[PDB]
Amino acid sequence: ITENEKISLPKIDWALDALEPYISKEINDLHINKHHVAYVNGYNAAIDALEKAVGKRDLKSVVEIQQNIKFHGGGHTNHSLFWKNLAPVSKGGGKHPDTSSALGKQIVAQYGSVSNLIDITNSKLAGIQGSGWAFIVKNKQNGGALDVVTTANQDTISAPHLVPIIAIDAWEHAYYLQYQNVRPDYFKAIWNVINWAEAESRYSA
Amino acid sequence: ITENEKISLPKIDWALDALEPYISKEINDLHINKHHVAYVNGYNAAIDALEKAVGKRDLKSVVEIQQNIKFHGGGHTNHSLFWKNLAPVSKGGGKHPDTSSALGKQIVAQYGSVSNLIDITNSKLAGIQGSGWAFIVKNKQNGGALDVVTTANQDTISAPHLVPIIAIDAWEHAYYLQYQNVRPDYFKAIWNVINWAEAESRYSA
Amino acid sequence: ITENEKISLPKIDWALDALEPYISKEINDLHINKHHVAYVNGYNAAIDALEKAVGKRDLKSVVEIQQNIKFHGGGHTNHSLFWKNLAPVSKGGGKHPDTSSALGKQIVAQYGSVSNLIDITNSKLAGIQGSGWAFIVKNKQNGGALDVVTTANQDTISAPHLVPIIAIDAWEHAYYLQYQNVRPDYFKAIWNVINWAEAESRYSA
Amino acid sequence: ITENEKISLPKIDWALDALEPYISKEINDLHINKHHVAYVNGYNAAIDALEKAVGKRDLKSVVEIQQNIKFHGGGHTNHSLFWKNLAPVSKGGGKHPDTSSALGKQIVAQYGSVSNLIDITNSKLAGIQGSGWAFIVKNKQNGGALDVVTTANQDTISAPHLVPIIAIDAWEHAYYLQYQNVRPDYFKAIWNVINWAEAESRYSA
Ligand SMILES: [Mn+2]
Ligand SMILES: [Mn+2]
Ligand SMILES: [Mn+2]
Ligand SMILES: [Mn+2]
């Protein structure tokens, strides 16, 4: 594994206790410093393992390692999107996107309001069985149309023609210390710290 | 939905705090009374929705409902197996199976010792990505041979030729409040409260 | 299993040899009379097995049978959609949808042309690994937006908010006798017998 | 991509028509020269795309490429195992393994006879939904115990502790031209040309 190929834990634009009372410092410290750090390490080790196996044409090891690449690679990708679409109330968290922005105009055209889109997303999040994510996505092929999708585990939006706009973590570790089994309460509460300014930038990028 | 079709939460043969210090009373209370209760209700609701859709030949609904049958039905089966293979130390929890038993003799012949089987099982548990279970299984068609398998979410040992001997819950709700992100500490801890008398009885049935 | 819950092979609105030179009579005869027939039988048997097991509250059998419900129920639904969106050239097969119809207006707004939408679908069909389908779908929640999706095996469009508009069978049995390994030639060829009038009715329904 | 990393189509130890009347020369010709060639080319293309994406830390592409590595790498491993465990009758195809061999002794001890194991394998094959494989496997951690498992599409026996002994292709391209929809006729016929000498050698390795 070379220095240019290795990934690192991203710097987070807000303090660990800044999402309170919606997401605790206790969850954020473990989520970033233990959970995200595990995917950073897992990806860098999986890449090192893969180059060694590929070089030897060990197709049995190559095949086995692919799953760890997908998982740790996806975990890093999902969590990085997550931290960037979260913001304290003081820093624009929970402020709806500007209705004149490309994203704001698209939400209005397809859903009528951000309120309805959030209801549709909370609905997808409730239906997730096990570990997974919900994403608000832009499709670059069908006129920049928005849709809400879910992925299992650390699976991500990897289709070249699709753009992740908002990423919501539904893994039990994302809410358990504060909400316990009451997953719908976390889903309802998170929107108060959602960074829609980042979502607008992602759409127009 | 007829009454004889409806499932119920089982009686657990130990107090909420009886598996301490290995599994907290806080975890068991939520695990039994919130988590397992949700699988009981979900299954009964899915069977009712299924019968209506099957009666109307509404195959689009039928196909959608089958996922909730699988998830909730599996959730009930898995947690029921789990409580039955958990026991307080004073009630034989953690006590290794009699080497003279059908299960005991099979463990010795295949793995040499219970400790080696536990080592294998803990490695399979460590490898679980996202929500899932590990099972020690008996295969009825290959000479009652044991193996260690894992399932995702609430998938269970449903094949008629396979018998679940030990079920270990690897979902984050099974350990998070006590062990947080340190899932290997939980997998190591659990064996101290595993009911091998139940596993011996499952092998012989 | 009752008489009202039983599914049957649908009547086909075209002669077996009427899709030639695009799809042969030889494929069509096996496709309808052996393949679709096997899903009709599989579903009716799975339903009979399900009522027996649900009644006995045999969660292990109930869980096992769900897979057969999904598969044969999906196979019947997918094939029924398929025959309805196929038509001889003499009966409107290959005729692009009317641009003033709700579907035609949506295609123009989102993709610019039917040809561009066909190119996107052919790209999705090319990327299917193993057995599966491609569908042009309408989403009732995001403003009636169209999208191209794939499913594996006999998985279908079962989400209540989604409508299958066009179903394209990519299983090897759908083309093998005529095209052999040359799967892209079949994908290119099938559009000449696609019934877009059925697609228009499905969108407006 | 470097030379040492590139895979090649293997030499097949029997003529295209050598397995007749069990597997036609038309099937073998396409299976080796079109189907397996597509896996060889696809894997080499995926390794090249992977190295470029890994080099520029483009994790979105990396995560997307992993599936093509798994599919093509698995496709090459599976077909290579397949040709090696196929033999013309005049070269010992269909001849049961020596009961004195390590494999032979293991079959007798677990299944009683090769015919009972074949029956078990044929039932697992019949149960495959869509594209997949059945494998007779040796587990190196539970006493070298044999079992029968199935994989979907081009998924393979990649776990380090498991050894594939016999691989059977259940994709429609493996039998369609000759057996059409009657897949059980193919599963029955294949055992007449299975190379058990290779299976014994795999077990002992
Ligand atoms: Mn997370
Ligand atoms: Mn649980
Ligand atoms: Mn078909
Ligand atoms: Mn093949």
PDB file of N, CA, C and O in Angstrom, chain A residues 44-108:
ATOM      1  N   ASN A  44      -7.716   0.695   4.501  1.00  0.00           N
ATOM      2  CA  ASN A  44      -6.266   0.706   4.236  1.00  0.00           C
ATOM      3  C   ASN A  44      -5.616  -0.690   4.310  1.00  0.00           C
ATOM      4  O   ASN A  44      -4.707  -0.989   3.529  1.00  0.00           O
ATOM      5  N   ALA A  45      -6.124  -1.553   5.205  1.00  0.00           N
ATOM      6  CA  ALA A  45      -5.651  -2.930   5.350  1.00  0.00           C
ATOM      7  C   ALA A  45      -6.155  -3.786   4.195  1.00  0.00           C
ATOM      8  O   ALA A  45      -5.375  -4.569   3.660  1.00  0.00           O
ATOM      9  N   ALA A  46      -7.436  -3.619   3.783  1.00  0.00           N
ATOM     10  CA  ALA A  46      -8.043  -4.362   2.664  1.00  0.00           C
ATOM     11  C   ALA A  46      -7.325  -4.080   1.343  1.00  0.00           C
ATOM     12  O   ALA A  46      -7.126  -5.007   0.554  1.00  0.00           O
ATOM     13  N   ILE A  47      -6.898  -2.825   1.123  1.00  0.00           N
ATOM     14  CA  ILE A  47      -6.151  -2.441  -0.085  1.00  0.00           C
ATOM     15  C   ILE A  47      -4.761  -3.079  -0.100  1.00  0.00           C
ATOM     16  O   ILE A  47      -4.303  -3.526  -1.156  1.00  0.00           O
ATOM     17  N   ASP A  48      -4.105  -3.132   1.076  1.00  0.00           N
ATOM     18  CA  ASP A  48      -2.782  -3.736   1.217  1.00  0.00           C
ATOM     19  C   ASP A  48      -2.883  -5.237   0.940  1.00  0.00           C
ATOM     20  O   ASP A  48      -2.039  -5.789   0.216  1.00  0.00           O
ATOM     21  N   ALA A  49      -3.944  -5.883   1.496  1.00  0.00           N
ATOM     22  CA  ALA A  49      -4.219  -7.310   1.316  1.00  0.00           C
ATOM     23  C   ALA A  49      -4.517  -7.641  -0.163  1.00  0.00           C
ATOM     24  O   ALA A  49      -4.054  -8.667  -0.678  1.00  0.00           O
ATOM     25  N   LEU A  50      -5.271  -6.757  -0.840  1.00  0.00           N
ATOM     26  CA  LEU A  50      -5.690  -6.893  -2.235  1.00  0.00           C
ATOM     27  C   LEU A  50      -4.513  -6.832  -3.225  1.00  0.00           C
ATOM     28  O   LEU A  50      -4.439  -7.684  -4.114  1.00  0.00           O
ATOM     29  N   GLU A  51      -3.594  -5.857  -3.067  1.00  0.00           N
ATOM     30  CA  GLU A  51      -2.426  -5.713  -3.967  1.00  0.00           C
ATOM     31  C   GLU A  51      -1.508  -6.937  -3.923  1.00  0.00           C
ATOM     32  O   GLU A  51      -0.990  -7.363  -4.963  1.00  0.00           O
ATOM     33  N   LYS A  52      -1.332  -7.509  -2.715  1.00  0.00           N
ATOM     34  CA  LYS A  52      -0.545  -8.718  -2.475  1.00  0.00           C
ATOM     35  C   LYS A  52      -1.208  -9.922  -3.175  1.00  0.00           C
ATOM     36  O   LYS A  52      -0.533 -10.619  -3.931  1.00  0.00           O
ATOM     37  N   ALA A  53      -2.539 -10.113  -2.995  1.00  0.00           N
ATOM     38  CA  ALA A  53      -3.281 -11.202  -3.643  1.00  0.00           C
ATOM     39  C   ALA A  53      -3.394 -11.072  -5.193  1.00  0.00           C
ATOM     40  O   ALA A  53      -3.274 -12.087  -5.897  1.00  0.00           O
ATOM     41  N   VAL A  54      -3.643  -9.841  -5.714  1.00  0.00           N
ATOM     42  CA  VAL A  54      -3.769  -9.531  -7.151  1.00  0.00           C
ATOM     43  C   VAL A  54      -2.449  -9.865  -7.860  1.00  0.00           C
ATOM     44  O   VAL A  54      -2.454 -10.528  -8.908  1.00  0.00           O
ATOM     45  N   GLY A  55      -1.344  -9.439  -7.248  1.00  0.00           N
ATOM     46  CA  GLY A  55       0.000  -9.657  -7.758  1.00  0.00           C
ATOM     47  C   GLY A  55       0.343 -11.118  -7.947  1.00  0.00           C
ATOM     48  O   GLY A  55       1.057 -11.468  -8.892  1.00  0.00           O
ATOM     49  N   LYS A  56      -0.176 -11.982  -7.046  1.00  0.00           N
ATOM     50  CA  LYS A  56       0.056 -13.431  -7.036  1.00  0.00           C
ATOM     51  C   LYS A  56      -0.996 -14.195  -7.842  1.00  0.00           C
ATOM     52  O   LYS A  56      -0.915 -15.428  -7.927  1.00  0.00           O
ATOM     53  N   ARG A  57      -1.991 -13.472  -8.420  1.00  0.00           N
ATOM     54  CA  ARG A  57      -3.132 -14.045  -9.148  1.00  0.00           C
ATOM     55  C   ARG A  57      -3.873 -15.041  -8.249  1.00  0.00           C
ATOM     56  O   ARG A  57      -4.288 -16.103  -8.721  1.00  0.00           O
ATOM     57  N   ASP A  58      -3.997 -14.719  -6.942  1.00  0.00           N
ATOM     58  CA  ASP A  58      -4.665 -15.582  -5.976  1.00  0.00           C
ATOM     59  C   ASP A  58      -6.144 -15.196  -6.010  1.00  0.00           C
ATOM     60  O   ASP A  58      -6.603 -14.441  -5.152  1.00  0.00           O
ATOM     61  N   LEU A  59      -6.867 -15.661  -7.047  1.00  0.00           N
ATOM     62  CA  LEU A  59      -8.258 -15.276  -7.259  1.00  0.00           C
ATOM     63  C   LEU A  59      -9.216 -15.593  -6.146  1.00  0.00           C
ATOM     64  O   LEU A  59     -10.151 -14.820  -5.930  1.00  0.00           O
ATOM     65  N   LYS A  60      -8.913 -16.644  -5.353  1.00  0.00           N
ATOM     66  CA  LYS A  60      -9.691 -16.997  -4.164  1.00  0.00           C
ATOM     67  C   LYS A  60      -9.557 -15.873  -3.088  1.00  0.00           C
ATOM     68  O   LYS A  60     -10.580 -15.446  -2.541  1.00  0.00           O
ATOM     69  N   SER A  61      -8.318 -15.360  -2.825  1.00  0.00           N
ATOM     70  CA  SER A  61      -8.126 -14.267  -1.850  1.00  0.00           C
ATOM     71  C   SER A  61      -8.694 -12.941  -2.395  1.00  0.00           C
ATOM     72  O   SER A  61      -9.368 -12.207  -1.660  1.00  0.00           O
ATOM     73  N   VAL A  62      -8.411 -12.649  -3.682  1.00  0.00           N
ATOM     74  CA  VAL A  62      -8.894 -11.455  -4.388  1.00  0.00           C
ATOM     75  C   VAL A  62     -10.429 -11.330  -4.186  1.00  0.00           C
ATOM     76  O   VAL A  62     -10.916 -10.289  -3.720  1.00  0.00           O
ATOM     77  N   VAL A  63     -11.155 -12.415  -4.481  1.00  0.00           N
ATOM     78  CA  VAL A  63     -12.618 -12.499  -4.341  1.00  0.00           C
ATOM     79  C   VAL A  63     -13.105 -12.248  -2.918  1.00  0.00           C
ATOM     80  O   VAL A  63     -14.030 -11.463  -2.731  1.00  0.00           O
ATOM     81  N   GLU A  64     -12.442 -12.865  -1.922  1.00  0.00           N
ATOM     82  CA  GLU A  64     -12.759 -12.723  -0.507  1.00  0.00           C
ATOM     83  C   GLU A  64     -12.588 -11.271  -0.014  1.00  0.00           C
ATOM     84  O   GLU A  64     -13.478 -10.756   0.670  1.00  0.00           O
ATOM     85  N   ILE A  65     -11.460 -10.617  -0.395  1.00  0.00           N
ATOM     86  CA  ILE A  65     -11.054  -9.255  -0.009  1.00  0.00           C
ATOM     87  C   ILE A  65     -12.022  -8.192  -0.550  1.00  0.00           C
ATOM     88  O   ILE A  65     -12.208  -7.171   0.102  1.00  0.00           O
ATOM     89  N   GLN A  66     -12.635  -8.426  -1.725  1.00  0.00           N
ATOM     90  CA  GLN A  66     -13.602  -7.499  -2.352  1.00  0.00           C
ATOM     91  C   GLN A  66     -14.676  -7.004  -1.400  1.00  0.00           C
ATOM     92  O   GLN A  66     -15.005  -5.817  -1.425  1.00  0.00           O
ATOM     93  N   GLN A  67     -15.236  -7.914  -0.574  1.00  0.00           N
ATOM     94  CA  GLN A  67     -16.284  -7.590   0.400  1.00  0.00           C
ATOM     95  C   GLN A  67     -15.771  -6.593   1.445  1.00  0.00           C
ATOM     96  O   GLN A  67     -16.501  -5.683   1.807  1.00  0.00           O
ATOM     97  N   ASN A  68     -14.498  -6.730   1.884  1.00  0.00           N
ATOM     98  CA  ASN A  68     -13.949  -5.803   2.872  1.00  0.00           C
ATOM     99  C   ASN A  68     -13.691  -4.446   2.263  1.00  0.00           C
ATOM    100  O   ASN A  68     -13.848  -3.428   2.935  1.00  0.00           O
ATOM    101  N   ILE A  69     -13.363  -4.422   0.966  1.00  0.00           N
ATOM    102  CA  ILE A  69     -13.166  -3.170   0.257  1.00  0.00           C
ATOM    103  C   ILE A  69     -14.488  -2.431   0.158  1.00  0.00           C
ATOM    104  O   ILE A  69     -14.562  -1.280   0.563  1.00  0.00           O
ATOM    105  N   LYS A  70     -15.531  -3.107  -0.319  1.00  0.00           N
ATOM    106  CA  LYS A  70     -16.890  -2.563  -0.430  1.00  0.00           C
ATOM    107  C   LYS A  70     -17.379  -2.018   0.920  1.00  0.00           C
ATOM    108  O   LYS A  70     -17.890  -0.902   0.975  1.00  0.00           O
ATOM    109  N   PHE A  71     -17.197  -2.800   1.994  1.00  0.00           N
ATOM    110  CA  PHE A  71     -17.665  -2.452   3.335  1.00  0.00           C
ATOM    111  C   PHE A  71     -16.934  -1.291   3.990  1.00  0.00           C
ATOM    112  O   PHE A  71     -17.581  -0.362   4.476  1.00  0.00           O
ATOM    113  N   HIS A  72     -15.604  -1.360   4.057  1.00  0.00           N
ATOM    114  CA  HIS A  72     -14.839  -0.299   4.697  1.00  0.00           C
ATOM    115  C   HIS A  72     -14.766   0.937   3.803  1.00  0.00           C
ATOM    116  O   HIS A  72     -14.865   2.050   4.300  1.00  0.00           O
ATOM    117  N   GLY A  73     -14.691   0.733   2.493  1.00  0.00           N
ATOM    118  CA  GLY A  73     -14.716   1.828   1.520  1.00  0.00           C
ATOM    119  C   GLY A  73     -16.034   2.581   1.565  1.00  0.00           C
ATOM    120  O   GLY A  73     -16.058   3.817   1.582  1.00  0.00           O
ATOM    121  N   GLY A  74     -17.118   1.829   1.677  1.00  0.00           N
ATOM    122  CA  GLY A  74     -18.466   2.380   1.778  1.00  0.00           C
ATOM    123  C   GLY A  74     -18.721   3.091   3.095  1.00  0.00           C
ATOM    124  O   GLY A  74     -19.380   4.130   3.112  1.00  0.00           O
ATOM    125  N   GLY A  75     -18.195   2.531   4.188  1.00  0.00           N
ATOM    126  CA  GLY A  75     -18.312   3.109   5.531  1.00  0.00           C
ATOM    127  C   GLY A  75     -17.654   4.468   5.619  1.00  0.00           C
ATOM    128  O   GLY A  75     -18.212   5.401   6.190  1.00  0.00           O
ATOM    129  N   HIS A  76     -16.471   4.599   5.005  1.00  0.00           N
ATOM    130  CA  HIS A  76     -15.744   5.870   4.973  1.00  0.00           C
ATOM    131  C   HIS A  76     -16.520   6.898   4.163  1.00  0.00           C
ATOM    132  O   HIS A  76     -16.675   8.028   4.617  1.00  0.00           O
ATOM    133  N   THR A  77     -17.019   6.481   2.975  1.00  0.00           N
ATOM    134  CA  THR A  77     -17.793   7.307   2.031  1.00  0.00           C
ATOM    135  C   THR A  77     -19.092   7.789   2.677  1.00  0.00           C
ATOM    136  O   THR A  77     -19.366   8.994   2.676  1.00  0.00           O
ATOM    137  N   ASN A  78     -19.868   6.856   3.260  1.00  0.00           N
ATOM    138  CA  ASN A  78     -21.134   7.205   3.937  1.00  0.00           C
ATOM    139  C   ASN A  78     -20.959   8.147   5.133  1.00  0.00           C
ATOM    140  O   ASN A  78     -21.670   9.147   5.225  1.00  0.00           O
ATOM    141  N   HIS A  79     -20.053   7.809   6.063  1.00  0.00           N
ATOM    142  CA  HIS A  79     -19.795   8.644   7.234  1.00  0.00           C
ATOM    143  C   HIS A  79     -19.280  10.047   6.891  1.00  0.00           C
ATOM    144  O   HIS A  79     -19.752  10.998   7.481  1.00  0.00           O
ATOM    145  N   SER A  80     -18.408  10.184   5.866  1.00  0.00           N
ATOM    146  CA  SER A  80     -17.897  11.485   5.399  1.00  0.00           C
ATOM    147  C   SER A  80     -19.033  12.351   4.856  1.00  0.00           C
ATOM    148  O   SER A  80     -19.039  13.558   5.097  1.00  0.00           O
ATOM    149  N   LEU A  81     -19.986  11.743   4.110  1.00  0.00           N
ATOM    150  CA  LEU A  81     -21.164  12.456   3.603  1.00  0.00           C
ATOM    151  C   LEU A  81     -22.012  12.866   4.789  1.00  0.00           C
ATOM    152  O   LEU A  81     -22.498  13.995   4.827  1.00  0.00           O
ATOM    153  N   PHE A  82     -22.173  11.953   5.768  1.00  0.00           N
ATOM    154  CA  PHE A  82     -22.983  12.191   6.976  1.00  0.00           C
ATOM    155  C   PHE A  82     -22.494  13.416   7.774  1.00  0.00           C
ATOM    156  O   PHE A  82     -23.265  14.347   7.962  1.00  0.00           O
ATOM    157  N   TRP A  83     -21.219  13.457   8.164  1.00  0.00           N
ATOM    158  CA  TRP A  83     -20.668  14.590   8.919  1.00  0.00           C
ATOM    159  C   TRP A  83     -20.841  15.949   8.209  1.00  0.00           C
ATOM    160  O   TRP A  83     -21.142  16.956   8.871  1.00  0.00           O
ATOM    161  N   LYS A  84     -20.677  15.953   6.865  1.00  0.00           N
ATOM    162  CA  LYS A  84     -20.829  17.134   6.013  1.00  0.00           C
ATOM    163  C   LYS A  84     -22.260  17.561   5.809  1.00  0.00           C
ATOM    164  O   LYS A  84     -22.476  18.731   5.494  1.00  0.00           O
ATOM    165  N   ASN A  85     -23.248  16.656   6.013  1.00  0.00           N
ATOM    166  CA  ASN A  85     -24.663  17.063   5.961  1.00  0.00           C
ATOM    167  C   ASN A  85     -25.331  17.198   7.332  1.00  0.00           C
ATOM    168  O   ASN A  85     -26.553  17.104   7.465  1.00  0.00           O
ATOM    169  N   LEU A  86     -24.500  17.448   8.344  1.00  0.00           N
ATOM    170  CA  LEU A  86     -24.913  17.717   9.709  1.00  0.00           C
ATOM    171  C   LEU A  86     -24.300  19.046  10.065  1.00  0.00           C
ATOM    172  O   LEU A  86     -23.187  19.343   9.618  1.00  0.00           O
ATOM    173  N   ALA A  87     -25.026  19.865  10.826  1.00  0.00           N
ATOM    174  CA  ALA A  87     -24.553  21.182  11.251  1.00  0.00           C
ATOM    175  C   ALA A  87     -25.302  21.626  12.492  1.00  0.00           C
ATOM    176  O   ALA A  87     -26.511  21.394  12.589  1.00  0.00           O
ATOM    177  N   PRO A  88     -24.620  22.301  13.442  1.00  0.00           N
ATOM    178  CA  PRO A  88     -25.350  22.836  14.608  1.00  0.00           C
ATOM    179  C   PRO A  88     -26.400  23.870  14.195  1.00  0.00           C
ATOM    180  O   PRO A  88     -26.303  24.441  13.102  1.00  0.00           O
ATOM    181  N   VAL A  89     -27.436  24.075  15.033  1.00  0.00           N
ATOM    182  CA  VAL A  89     -28.511  25.029  14.737  1.00  0.00           C
ATOM    183  C   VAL A  89     -27.932  26.423  14.446  1.00  0.00           C
ATOM    184  O   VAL A  89     -28.283  27.016  13.419  1.00  0.00           O
ATOM    185  N   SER A  90     -26.939  26.855  15.256  1.00  0.00           N
ATOM    186  CA  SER A  90     -26.225  28.132  15.115  1.00  0.00           C
ATOM    187  C   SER A  90     -25.503  28.301  13.753  1.00  0.00           C
ATOM    188  O   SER A  90     -25.265  29.430  13.326  1.00  0.00           O
ATOM    189  N   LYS A  91     -25.165  27.180  13.081  1.00  0.00           N
ATOM    190  CA  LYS A  91     -24.451  27.174  11.803  1.00  0.00           C
ATOM    191  C   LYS A  91     -25.316  26.755  10.582  1.00  0.00           C
ATOM    192  O   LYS A  91     -24.784  26.271   9.585  1.00  0.00           O
ATOM    193  N   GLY A  92     -26.622  26.969  10.670  1.00  0.00           N
ATOM    194  CA  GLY A  92     -27.557  26.661   9.594  1.00  0.00           C
ATOM    195  C   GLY A  92     -28.227  25.301   9.639  1.00  0.00           C
ATOM    196  O   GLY A  92     -28.994  24.973   8.729  1.00  0.00           O
ATOM    197  N   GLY A  93     -27.941  24.510  10.682  1.00  0.00           N
ATOM    198  CA  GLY A  93     -28.552  23.198  10.865  1.00  0.00           C
ATOM    199  C   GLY A  93     -30.052  23.308  11.019  1.00  0.00           C
ATOM    200  O   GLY A  93     -30.537  24.156  11.776  1.00  0.00           O
ATOM    201  N   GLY A  94     -30.776  22.536  10.209  1.00  0.00           N
ATOM    202  CA  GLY A  94     -32.234  22.546  10.199  1.00  0.00           C
ATOM    203  C   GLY A  94     -32.875  23.595   9.298  1.00  0.00           C
ATOM    204  O   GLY A  94     -34.099  23.576   9.107  1.00  0.00           O
ATOM    205  N   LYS A  95     -32.076  24.519   8.735  1.00  0.00           N
ATOM    206  CA  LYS A  95     -32.628  25.567   7.858  1.00  0.00           C
ATOM    207  C   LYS A  95     -32.898  24.981   6.493  1.00  0.00           C
ATOM    208  O   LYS A  95     -31.989  24.432   5.870  1.00  0.00           O
ATOM    209  N   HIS A  96     -34.167  25.049   6.049  1.00  0.00           N
ATOM    210  CA  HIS A  96     -34.583  24.493   4.767  1.00  0.00           C
ATOM    211  C   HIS A  96     -33.824  25.074   3.574  1.00  0.00           C
ATOM    212  O   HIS A  96     -33.360  26.213   3.664  1.00  0.00           O
ATOM    213  N   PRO A  97     -33.607  24.302   2.478  1.00  0.00           N
ATOM    214  CA  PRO A  97     -32.847  24.862   1.349  1.00  0.00           C
ATOM    215  C   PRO A  97     -33.600  26.011   0.669  1.00  0.00           C
ATOM    216  O   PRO A  97     -34.838  26.074   0.711  1.00  0.00           O
ATOM    217  N   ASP A  98     -32.837  26.954   0.105  1.00  0.00           N
ATOM    218  CA  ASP A  98     -33.386  28.118  -0.589  1.00  0.00           C
ATOM    219  C   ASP A  98     -34.193  27.624  -1.801  1.00  0.00           C
ATOM    220  O   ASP A  98     -33.657  26.887  -2.627  1.00  0.00           O
ATOM    221  N   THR A  99     -35.511  27.945  -1.840  1.00  0.00           N
ATOM    222  CA  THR A  99     -36.445  27.511  -2.898  1.00  0.00           C
ATOM    223  C   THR A  99     -36.088  27.967  -4.307  1.00  0.00           C
ATOM    224  O   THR A  99     -36.639  27.421  -5.269  1.00  0.00           O
ATOM    225  N   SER A 100     -35.149  28.945  -4.434  1.00  0.00           N
ATOM    226  CA  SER A 100     -34.655  29.465  -5.717  1.00  0.00           C
ATOM    227  C   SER A 100     -33.358  28.762  -6.151  1.00  0.00           C
ATOM    228  O   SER A 100     -32.918  28.964  -7.285  1.00  0.00           O
ATOM    229  N   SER A 101     -32.747  27.932  -5.264  1.00  0.00           N
ATOM    230  CA  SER A 101     -31.548  27.157  -5.625  1.00  0.00           C
ATOM    231  C   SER A 101     -31.987  26.008  -6.545  1.00  0.00           C
ATOM    232  O   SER A 101     -33.188  25.673  -6.579  1.00  0.00           O
ATOM    233  N   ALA A 102     -31.037  25.416  -7.307  1.00  0.00           N
ATOM    234  CA  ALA A 102     -31.342  24.289  -8.210  1.00  0.00           C
ATOM    235  C   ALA A 102     -32.028  23.135  -7.444  1.00  0.00           C
ATOM    236  O   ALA A 102     -33.040  22.615  -7.908  1.00  0.00           O
ATOM    237  N   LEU A 103     -31.515  22.792  -6.235  1.00  0.00           N
ATOM    238  CA  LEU A 103     -32.084  21.767  -5.367  1.00  0.00           C
ATOM    239  C   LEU A 103     -33.459  22.190  -4.859  1.00  0.00           C
ATOM    240  O   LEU A 103     -34.406  21.408  -4.957  1.00  0.00           O
ATOM    241  N   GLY A 104     -33.552  23.415  -4.334  1.00  0.00           N
ATOM    242  CA  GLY A 104     -34.791  23.980  -3.804  1.00  0.00           C
ATOM    243  C   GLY A 104     -35.897  23.991  -4.833  1.00  0.00           C
ATOM    244  O   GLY A 104     -37.037  23.650  -4.524  1.00  0.00           O
ATOM    245  N   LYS A 105     -35.558  24.354  -6.063  1.00  0.00           N
ATOM    246  CA  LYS A 105     -36.489  24.362  -7.198  1.00  0.00           C
ATOM    247  C   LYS A 105     -36.930  22.932  -7.522  1.00  0.00           C
ATOM    248  O   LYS A 105     -38.103  22.713  -7.805  1.00  0.00           O
ATOM    249  N   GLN A 106     -35.997  21.962  -7.476  1.00  0.00           N
ATOM    250  CA  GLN A 106     -36.332  20.562  -7.767  1.00  0.00           C
ATOM    251  C   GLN A 106     -37.260  19.933  -6.719  1.00  0.00           C
ATOM    252  O   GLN A 106     -38.187  19.223  -7.100  1.00  0.00           O
ATOM    253  N   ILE A 107     -37.019  20.220  -5.409  1.00  0.00           N
ATOM    254  CA  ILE A 107     -37.839  19.731  -4.296  1.00  0.00           C
ATOM    255  C   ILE A 107     -39.267  20.240  -4.492  1.00  0.00           C
ATOM    256  O   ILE A 107     -40.211  19.459  -4.399  1.00  0.00           O
ATOM    257  N   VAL A 108     -39.406  21.553  -4.776  1.00  0.00           N
ATOM    258  CA  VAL A 108     -40.694  22.207  -4.988  1.00  0.00           C
ATOM    259  C   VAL A 108     -41.451  21.573  -6.159  1.00  0.00           C
ATOM    260  O   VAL A 108     -42.615  21.199  -6.001  1.00  0.00           O
TER     261      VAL A 108
END
